[PDB]
């Protein structure tokens with residue numbers, strides 16, 4: 001169904017849909033591992049399906065249509081606690097590379113592309129534990145795509161080599177994120 005912000009289980013998959021209160025976004029859970037998002041003049045939002053809790057060796061399959069018009073990402077996305085970390089394995093993005101201005105720490109080759117690795121920080125921003133300061137870990141795929149498989153272990157292991165430690169995994173989803181833009185997407189996870 002189309003839903004308001006929240007989390008839960010739908011047709012065998014965890015989902016998380018969050019937004020900053022700005023209008024312009026419609027997030028809809030579909031059959032099985034499918035979800036869709038349609039947005040126009042949105043604020044910041046993040047929505048998708050996966051698992052709760054996530055694991056450090058899952059191979060995640062995603063497919064569908066991803067048509068952003070502006071700033072948006074399509075990523076394997078999740079959190080850990082102890083330490084609190086928001087992480088992204090970005091498979092595709094729109095007009096803005098999320099690593100812009102960030103210091104590159106490394107690279108990893110996985111599932112048909114090299115990815116560049118970065119660490120950034122958010123100060124007193126929304127998080128799974130409420131407003132908080134936390135680091136973000138990024139692997140950014142060089143060869144953009146909208147279907148395929150992500151061997152998360154390759155990324156988590158590469159990050160660990162850079163001192164980017166993950167604690168206990170909270171949720172782990174394939175998420176469509178938008179930042180004051182427009183677009184449409186229909187993604188299926190497994």
Ligand SMILES: [Zn+2]
Nearest residue numbers: 093094095144
């Ligand atoms: Zn393009």
Ligand SMILES: [Zn+2]
Nearest residue numbers: 092093144145
């Ligand atoms: Zn592209």
Ligand SMILES: [Zn+2]
Nearest residue numbers: 092143144145
């Ligand atoms: Zn392309």
Ligand SMILES: [Zn+2]
Nearest residue numbers: 093142143144
């Ligand atoms: Zn391109």
Ligand SMILES: [Zn+2]
Nearest residue numbers: 093143144145
């Ligand atoms: Zn292109």
